Enzyme design. Sequence first.
Site, PDB file in Angstrom:
ATOM      1  CB  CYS A  41     -47.241  -3.095  46.495  1.00 54.03           C
ATOM      2  SG  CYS A  41     -46.012  -1.981  47.212  1.00 54.03           S
TER       3      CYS A  41
ATOM      4  CB  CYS B 113     -50.467  -3.866  40.816  1.00 49.85           C
ATOM      5  SG  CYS B 113     -51.080  -2.278  40.196  1.00 49.85           S
ATOM      6  CG  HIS B 114     -47.595  -6.867  42.666  1.00 44.46           C
ATOM      7  ND1 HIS B 114     -47.116  -7.543  41.566  1.00 44.46           N
ATOM      8  CD2 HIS B 114     -47.029  -5.634  42.617  1.00 44.46           C
ATOM      9  CE1 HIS B 114     -46.287  -6.731  40.896  1.00 44.46           C
ATOM     10  NE2 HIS B 114     -46.198  -5.556  41.492  1.00 44.46           N
TER      11      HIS B 114
ATOM     12  CG  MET C 125     -56.895   7.301  42.004  1.00 43.43           C
ATOM     13  SD  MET C 125     -56.990   7.499  40.197  1.00 43.43           S
ATOM     14  CE  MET C 125     -58.505   8.456  40.082  1.00 43.43           C
TER      15      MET C 125
ATOM     16  CG  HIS D 250     -63.051  -1.433  37.254  1.00 46.90           C
ATOM     17  ND1 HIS D 250     -62.616  -1.695  38.540  1.00 46.90           N
ATOM     18  CD2 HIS D 250     -63.483  -0.149  37.268  1.00 46.90           C
ATOM     19  CE1 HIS D 250     -62.792  -0.628  39.289  1.00 46.90           C
ATOM     20  NE2 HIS D 250     -63.318   0.330  38.540  1.00 46.90           N
TER      21      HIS D 250
ATOM     22  CG  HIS E 249     -62.622   3.838  34.091  1.00 49.99           C
ATOM     23  ND1 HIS E 249     -63.512   4.851  34.371  1.00 49.99           N
ATOM     24  CD2 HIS E 249     -62.445   3.159  35.245  1.00 49.99           C
ATOM     25  CE1 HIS E 249     -63.866   4.779  35.640  1.00 49.99           C
ATOM     26  NE2 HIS E 249     -63.229   3.764  36.195  1.00 49.99           N
TER      27      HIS E 249
END
Lengths: 559, 559
Positions: free
Chosen positions: A57, A60-61, A98, A337, A380
Amino acid sequence: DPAAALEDHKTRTDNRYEPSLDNLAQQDVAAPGAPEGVTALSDAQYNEANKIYFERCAGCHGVLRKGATGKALTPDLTRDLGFDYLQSFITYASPAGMPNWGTSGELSAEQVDLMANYLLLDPAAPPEFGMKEMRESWKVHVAPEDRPTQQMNDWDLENLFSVTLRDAGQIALIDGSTYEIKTVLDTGYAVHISRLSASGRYLFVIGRDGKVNMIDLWMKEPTTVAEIKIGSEARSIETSKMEGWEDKYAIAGAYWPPQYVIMDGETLEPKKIQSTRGMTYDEQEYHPEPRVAAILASHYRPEFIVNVKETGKILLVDYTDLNNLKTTEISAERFLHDGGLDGSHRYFITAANARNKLVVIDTKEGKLVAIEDTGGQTPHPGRGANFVHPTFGPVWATSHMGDDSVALIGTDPEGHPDNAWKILDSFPALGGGSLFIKTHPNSQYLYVDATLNPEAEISGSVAVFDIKAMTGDGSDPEFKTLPIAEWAGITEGQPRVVQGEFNKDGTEVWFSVWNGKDQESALVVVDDKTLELKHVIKDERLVTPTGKFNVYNTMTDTY
Amino acid sequence: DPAAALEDHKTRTDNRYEPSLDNLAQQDVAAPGAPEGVTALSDAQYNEANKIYFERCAGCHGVLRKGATGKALTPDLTRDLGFDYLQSFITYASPAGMPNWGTSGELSAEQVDLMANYLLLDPAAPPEFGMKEMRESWKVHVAPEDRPTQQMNDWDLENLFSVTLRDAGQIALIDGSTYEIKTVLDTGYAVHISRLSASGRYLFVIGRDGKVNMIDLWMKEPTTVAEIKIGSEARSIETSKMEGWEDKYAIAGAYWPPQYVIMDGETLEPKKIQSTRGMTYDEQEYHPEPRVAAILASHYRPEFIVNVKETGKILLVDYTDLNNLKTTEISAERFLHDGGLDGSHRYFITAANARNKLVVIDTKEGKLVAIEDTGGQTPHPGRGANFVHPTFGPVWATSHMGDDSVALIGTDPEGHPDNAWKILDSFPALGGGSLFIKTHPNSQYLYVDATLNPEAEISGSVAVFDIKAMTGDGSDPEFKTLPIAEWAGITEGQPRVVQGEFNKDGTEVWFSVWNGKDQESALVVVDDKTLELKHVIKDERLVTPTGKFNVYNTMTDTY
Ligand code: DHE
Ligand code: DHE
Ligand code: HEC
Ligand code: HEC
């Protein structure tokens, strides 16, 4: 309502590439007390939930729960939502990580309750990692004065490929012409990328756990001559590339703590640690966890180019004076990124992925030049693909994780001003889930993988466009589909093809046919001129092969 | 041994000048949960303890308890010490704050327990204060277009003094020649300093609560034309002083959140917020609460000079481009506080007070050029005192809070090379507890107060050295003692004399005779030529007068 999780918490082709802080997750934490109206979790329960949180988690958070691509989940907010909402929402689980190592995102009823309860409690910040800790981990195995003064092995170093054997925490050094595995080196941790010093003598690898190893390729038997730990979670490293500064410095970027570290290029001695905690560029609000993503090196000034994800800042760090440190903090776009320099090596083009934008920085002038939406979902590029489009002139290309599109941006302000920094074309490749696009100056082909595609056939293949045939007339350029995985001849699982990388001559391109730790993998070499299979590399030692980096192309930034 | 508190927490002349976060203390906080093995405090108890902590302890130990001049007091550390130790240690009382308004440092038995328990609990970080919050507080009372185009009052603005009437949150605008209090303006909370725009038209004041007000001195009745809040605790503000950038920007520094903010010089619109959280310069360890101390403005480049206390970094912030932000982060010495530019306005000389060092930065080259120990205890120069010593050449002087010494440092690397950045002389003044030393180019006298001295005779007087009589023989220069408090004719709880400030012509120097809120205070004007009493300013409105800033001397950095 909790059912909203069906659109936010399910797996997409473009939400599987967020950080999994599985090394940091190994640290035990103390269970906090709970204020009135909140129930405490036991030490075991809290640690169990913390491990799940960090592995699944936090990407993302945030470990501090202040939000990243996903919203903040701080106690004030979660307590207002309430346990029932949290329990119902979390029952749907979360996005898978992944393939071949990441989480499925599935949770048991017990785990769901643990997570709901965990989110209602006050989290502590994981330990910092500064100079004392770094120096403690710093080991110089072979002092510079004891190293060779010239190459002592007979290898063709510039044509060597440094291949990540992911799960085994090793790398394979493979001869680019004979395909012989020259050596397999232990790093004792999953290596994320390999980078080369500007001279090509020193090979640097960064482990996901923050461990850096530097290898002297001139040794009769190349091995780690120095190592150091620079954080708890890290994914990036780069070497100094400004003329006159060859082999002087290396820089590593960390997710936790949020910081970058400049190290002596010969010994790895930690020289300067810079925190990336700071303000978001747009709303100008403090963010406590701005992770360092890609790091490149300027060819125009003695600077490192550092992407700070959550705050949307690109830092140009001048390494000529680490005491009176000059930096240019460029307001760009949030969620920076990866990216690469254009063909001339003057402009840095980077994907602010979650916002579908390409940010362009002029490294000579040290300023933002453009921000353009690619029209696709979640670009990406890796380092991208520079080529001369027959009609548009010099362009840089990127594929997308969220859809099948390939976007081209003009990169020639002087010779093609009307095309400069504008998205010139967008066309489909194999499908969604692409991670890497590749070409080389000597090739007439543009290769595009589809690693994260949910269809085995697609994820096991690569699209190849003929650059020479591109007209840019608005139609969709045809592409040949190379059955890379099929060529590798692997029976088990659904191996995923990932990342093309050329040899020094730009005549052959390698792809990893990536299967899990307990399955068979391979590397496939394609003859660039004919688009036919050249060679299949298999060896019992070749476990979970992923990133591949040719010494010459990496040291010179040829892509 | 808790008895160590007798030494550690003893009130000294040099440990009374640490932050009292009494505005931040006003925020009500909820009690955290207590982990197993720890007793919880109710919301009321915790909130009571928090207020005391912020008001009396956070200055030295940090609101986050990670340490400042005093060590860290985080739960992991305090729980190891245990309640008994904490209770016993804290019973001995803590260092007193500043005279007249500061804490006594004594606690009741009930408060001692609240504090010991509070230290065993996990503290939350106070709220951040970003762009949204700043813009919500932003008020432009008189838009630039509606302001006068020329001075509309008959005041001699350059000879005007802006005087802090501390406790009441007011400032008195006092005529430099008639000594008439022209007006008393209210801003809410205690104003810490007054600064002038480079043109001398705009008067900027920063309240300890983070409130900034800008006053238009050209109005028939000067009043605030714009205001904005930039944090919860702040003590510094400055205006742009590079030629060509007059009235362009203002910058404010905050203690909480740890950040500085660049604002439009005409409207106070917040333009760029920069966090100061980062790494200490020497042992390179992350510090979560590096407070901004003094802020000066470069006359050589379009930059602000920002002192970051706990990390020992001096930031040179280029305001020519706030999007592609260029800064130089200079590793200096920890505990940077105040300082000033030399006579040529090229070198910034600042006190890293707790370490007894003077750090010198070349603002033209943007680099540190020297770090020298003053030989005294805890230098506190204010902006210091520049003068051409008859034998040593250009020097800058500072007195000390910890002892009676005055130190002179050479400031002429080109003209007096051997003497540059070296302590050339050290000699005694009235006694310890000094806060400000002062001179003016038109004066031959060097004035030194002794505000924090425990003896009334000393704290109410000022030492005056005759610069013309100074030789380079190494002996101690004699000084005349001016009975400032006595001249004021006030018999109250030993009023303390503080801070000399000259009029525009440098013919008269003012001192504040600072008494408590419910006591009588005064301003004493001394004739610089005769060193005799000129005039005493008394008024029922003149409550707790402290800092005084002459418009001309402040706008031109003449000291
Ligand atoms: C920040 C970052 C970079 C840029 C490095 C640079 O340029 O210095 C990068 C680059 C990369 C590159 C760079 C390729 C290049 O050509 O530059 C590769 C091959 C790669 C293979 C993978 N990455 Fe990567 N990667 C992450 C982060 C990053 N990856 C993650 O956070 C993530 C999503 C999950 C994690 O916790 O690690 C992740 C998972 C993966 C994989 O699963 C891959 C496919 C296989 C592996 O070995 O882990 N990442
Ligand atoms: C950071 C800082 C500066 C530099 C400002 C700049 O350069 O822009 C400064 C300057 C100053 C200056 C600058 C003088 C100058 O000539 O530049 C003065 C007069 C001054 C009078 C006081 N200061 Fe000050 N002062 C603090 C901090 C600071 N003081 C504190 O933290 C402290 C110790 C306690 C607090 O919580 O405020 C504190 C208490 C005081 C006082 O009690 C004084 C004596 C009276 C008052 O009004 O509060 N401070
Ligand atoms: C990124 C790929 C995610 C992962 C992995 C996890 N979450 Fe998430 N979460 C994400 C999004 C895009 C959203 C929707 C809101 C938004 O930011 O756009 C959410 C939402 C939640 C919520 C609901 C919060 C609210 O309604 O205010 C919760 C409670 C939550 N997420 C929890 C959570 C947990 C415990 C995870 C690991 C098991 C997790 N998320 C992973 C994106 C992503
Ligand atoms: C600065 C002038 C201080 C003020 C105000 C307060 N404290 Fe302090 N404290 C200070 C010092 C110099 C020291 C000694 C250790 C060092 O940093 O050199 C201390 C020590 C403590 C301790 C003991 C911690 C230990 O590990 O032994 C405690 C428990 C402590 N101080 C508490 C405390 C509280 C609660 C205060 C406000 C009432 C307070 N201190 C003020 C310096 C200063």
